[PDB]
Amino acid sequence: SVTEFLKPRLVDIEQVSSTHAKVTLEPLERGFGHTLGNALRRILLSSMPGCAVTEVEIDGVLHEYSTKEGVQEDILEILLNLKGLAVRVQGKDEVILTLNKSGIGPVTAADITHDGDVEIVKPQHVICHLTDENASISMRIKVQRGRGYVPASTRIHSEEDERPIGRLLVDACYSPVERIAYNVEAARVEQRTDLDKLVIEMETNGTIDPEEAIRRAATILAEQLEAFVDLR
Amino acid sequence: SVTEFLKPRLVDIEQVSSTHAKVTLEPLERGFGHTLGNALRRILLSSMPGCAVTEVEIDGVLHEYSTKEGVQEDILEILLNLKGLAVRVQGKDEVILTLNKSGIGPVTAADITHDGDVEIVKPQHVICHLTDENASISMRIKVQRGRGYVPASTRPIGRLLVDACYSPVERIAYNVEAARVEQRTDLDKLVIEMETNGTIDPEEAIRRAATILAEQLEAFVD
Amino acid sequence: GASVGIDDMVIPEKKHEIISEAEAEVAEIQEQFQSGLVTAGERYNKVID
Amino acid sequence: KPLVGTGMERAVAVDSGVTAVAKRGGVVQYVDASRIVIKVNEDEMYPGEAGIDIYNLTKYTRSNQNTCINQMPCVSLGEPVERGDVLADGPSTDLGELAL
Amino acid sequence: EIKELLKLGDLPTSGQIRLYDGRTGEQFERPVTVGYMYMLKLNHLVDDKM
Amino acid sequence: LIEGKAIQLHPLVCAAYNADFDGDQMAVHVPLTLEAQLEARALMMSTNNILSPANGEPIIVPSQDVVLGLYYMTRDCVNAKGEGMVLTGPKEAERLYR
Amino acid sequence: ARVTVQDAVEKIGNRFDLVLVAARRARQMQVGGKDPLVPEENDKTTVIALREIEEGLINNQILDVRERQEQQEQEAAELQAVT
RNA sequence: AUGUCAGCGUGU
Ligand SMILES: [Mg+2]
């Protein structure tokens, strides 16, 4: 109808795995598919709120360039694996998890004590490898909520507690989305035969609902475009 | 803090002409300048609804490569001038206009038979030049309300098809520059330069494009 | 989106034939020199040419 | 590791004294981020000896160019080893290959 | 041999793939050469030079 | 003013400097008198220096990527999309390409 | 608000006396509190001096005429006040 | 609150 655009809407959420997923939005009118797909891809890859490990405190280790008697992996490597932990915090923004392990074997992400308001998407993610029988590792993990990539250098801008010795810092990559790829195909809707559907494939860490991610991206884009809608 | 983001401000409009504008927005989230620029550019130059000429019937001319003796311009330049003509139709999907002119050849748009619904914004648009005084030109213009550029090649012997150009945006160009606030020098400033054919003021094009995108996104607004 | 790939540097298909012909000519000149019909400097200049 | 190499990474890594190379074969009795203890084989045992090889890896020591020299183990408990096998990876070395 | 190894995987034999623009999204007008290369960080840091 | 640690140099003035973005370093001096500032603006500015004093040849010439881009733009195929079309002006051509 | 000084150079015609004239005018405005002859679009003193040079409002002849007039008037006023 | 010698290296 020239001055009428058919309203796109969500029609399918194909959860291939706990992380990989495909969302489908249809119908679209002769070019809006590429525009919407590009906007959603550029918004999801940069402005997706998430949670990641921010601060680590080990019982005996006092700085990042030391080693603990018993662990097969270095403390720097331990923080490196901790950076890759995937977690979903529901209800609050700050969580202090506690890990306590003893005995020969790997330390997996299932050893963190249950918190109720915190869920672990990767329960078999390794952290360290205790080798001596009389070796025990106790860790306290401060996990925050945020967006983007905030290196530890920018998080020490203001000194409040002066960062007591023995408290290590790990750069946080708050983004829960790792890969986005959109594809625009032709779809049949009311025999128009000129309409397109958009399939967005998202590979995440499993801590984000793909439908929630799409709705969040659309909300961000609309909130930004309301300024142009007003235009002083 | 997580959902606060940053809202564009410092919105200033400068007008090169009545159909030319530049808009500057300094505070924007990093990378969001491209997202808000490319999408708007695509919508503006490929989805804006508007009325434009589609086909024209030339009296005495059968094909676009023929020649009319009385007119100085060839058929190609006549079609070009007709395509450049800006029209505004209210309440009618498609209308037929009649042009009849004889004598001297400063044939502008003011000689178009007025029908009330059509409103030629620029009536000085020269369509053809008649050399011989004892010569006449009669044309049947057809204007339709469409959306975006529709070339005639991809899309009645006497009738000749002209490129549609339904979009009322002659040129749109976005640029992104550095911008800093609160010592964050990574932010993006968006500068949009637009040139409209004349049917609507340039800021109305931006308003309509933003409204179209918001309506499209309304399904997943929250 | 210009780019460099290993297929861009198109080796001419006649390169091997030209090289073989030049090698045959050099071999003929060398064999003529072995018969003593030409000297070392002249044969060197001929090979270079 | 270099995805494309020349096969000389092993020789350069082993010959340079940056990695810990087992002197005698046996099984790895004890692994840690700092030290390695190897229980040597009975064939290579010497008379009147307990028969363990102790390797104290150098961790985070400055070099002459103010860089960091670090040695990391690349063996696990119970893994048999032979003479000349790498037990720890030095700086810019991955499993006995030069990794710059 | 390089082409054979590429064909063993699910990759183009010519070694050039079709990329997309990150900012705008339009296809680049020609296929580009992507791959994996060994990169070295030399001991010339800007913080030591400024 | 830029956020970073390296001096950002114009691509066109490299040829005069014989500089490459190669790890080469450069020095910055600040004229701190009115006369020195006027001399820098009227004599030492890069806009003033466009012809080489050695022979009068221009020193600002596109070298590597500008030439390649302009060469790609100004080139004609034989069966490209939209061949043989008639356009009102450069703006229509730019819109059609975009 | 300045990129090139070609017009100012051709107005002065020397490209060296231009520097001295602009410096003297800039010192007059910066230290002597002289009101610029052109609107100041958040511009530095040197650029303002060059800009008002561009349209012939400042030159060596004009500058020395102005300073001679100023010194004559101020000395006359001082003499009148003293007497 | 230096200087010098020697060596290595970077950019030309
Ligand atoms: Mg260099």
Closest CA to B129 of B89, B181, B77, B92: B77
C-alpha span between D5 and E48 (Å, rounded): 31
Q: What dihedral angle (degrees, nearest 10) is formed by the CA atoms of B126, B131, B133, B138?
A: -50
Q: Which nucleotide comes closest to F24 if you measure CA to C1'?
A: H11
Query: Which residue is closest to E35 within chain D, CA to CA?
Result: D3
C-alpha span between E15 and E34 (Å, rounded): 7
Q: Which chains touch E (3 or more CB pairs under 8 A)?
A: A, B, C, D, F
SS3 A67: coil
SS3 B201: coil
- Cβ atoms within 10 Å, residue A52: 26
Fold category of D18-92 in CATH: OB fold (Dihydrolipoamide Acetyltransferase, E2P) (2.40.50)
**CATH class of the structural domain A50-174:** mainly beta
Helical ranges in chain A per DSSP H: 32-44, 75-83, 210-230
DSSP class of A113: P
SS3 C31: helix
C-alpha span between A218 and B221 (Å, rounded): 6
The pair phi, psi for residue A227, each rounded to 5°, is -65, -45
Secondary structure element (H or E) that encloses residue B45, with its range: helix B32-46
The pair phi, psi for residue B206, each rounded to 5°, is -65, -45
**Count of CB pairs separated by less than 8 Å, E with F:** 8
- F-chain residues near E40 (CB < 8 A): none
Experimental determination approach used:
cryo-EM
Domain ranges of chain B: 2-49+167-222, 50-166
DSSP class of A8: P
Contact B191, B18 (CB under 8 A): no
CATH number, residue G18 = 3.90.940.10
Q: Does B2-49+167-222 match B50-166 in CATH topology?
A: no
Secondary structure element (H or E) that encloses residue B20, with its range: strand B20-25
Contact D78, D28 (CB under 8 A): yes
Domain around G35 = 1-83
Closest CA to D41 of D50, D49, D31, D51: D51
> Number of folded domains in chain G?
1
**Beta-carbon contacts of residue A55 (< 8 Å; ≥ 6 apart):** A141, A142, A167, A168, A169, A170
Q: Are G19 and F48 inside 8 Å of each other by CB?
A: no
What b-and-e string marks burial along G5-19, b requiring 16 or more CB atoms within 10 Å of the CB?
beebbeebeeeeebb
Pairing status of strand A105-108 against strand A126-130: antiparallel
Measured CA to CA in angstroms, residue A73 lies from A82, A143, D71, F8 at distances of 12, 22, 11, 42
Q: Output the six-digit token pair for C4.
A: 């460099």
Determine the distance separating the centroid of ligand 1 and the alpha carbon of G3, expressed in angstroms.
29
**Domain B50-166, second-level architecture:** Beta Complex (2.170)
What b-and-e string marks burial along B4-27, b requiring 16 or more CB atoms within 10 Å of the CB?
eebebeeeeeeeeeebebbbbbbb
**HEC letters along F34-60:** HHHHHHHHHHHCCCCCCECCCCCCECC
Resolution of the deposited coordinates, in angstroms? 3.1
What b-and-e string marks burial along A195-220, b requiring 16 or more CB atoms within 10 Å of the CB?
bbbbbbbbebbbbbebeebbbbbbbb
Superfamily of domain B2-49+167-222: RNA polymerase, RBP11-like subunit (3.30.1360.10)
Fold category of A2-49+175-232 in CATH: Gyrase A; domain 2 (3.30.1360)
The DSSP line for A157-196 is SS-SS---TT-EE--EE---EEEEEEEEEEE-STT---EE
C-alpha span between G18 and F48 (Å, rounded): 14
Query: Which residue is closest to A2 within chain B, CA to CA?
Result: B146
Closest CA to B88 of B144, B162, B18: B144
Contact G1, G47 (CB under 8 A): yes
**Beta-carbon contacts of residue A95 (< 8 Å; ≥ 6 apart):** A51, A87, A89, A115, A117, A118, A142, A143
Distance from CA of E21 to the nearest CA of A (A): 10
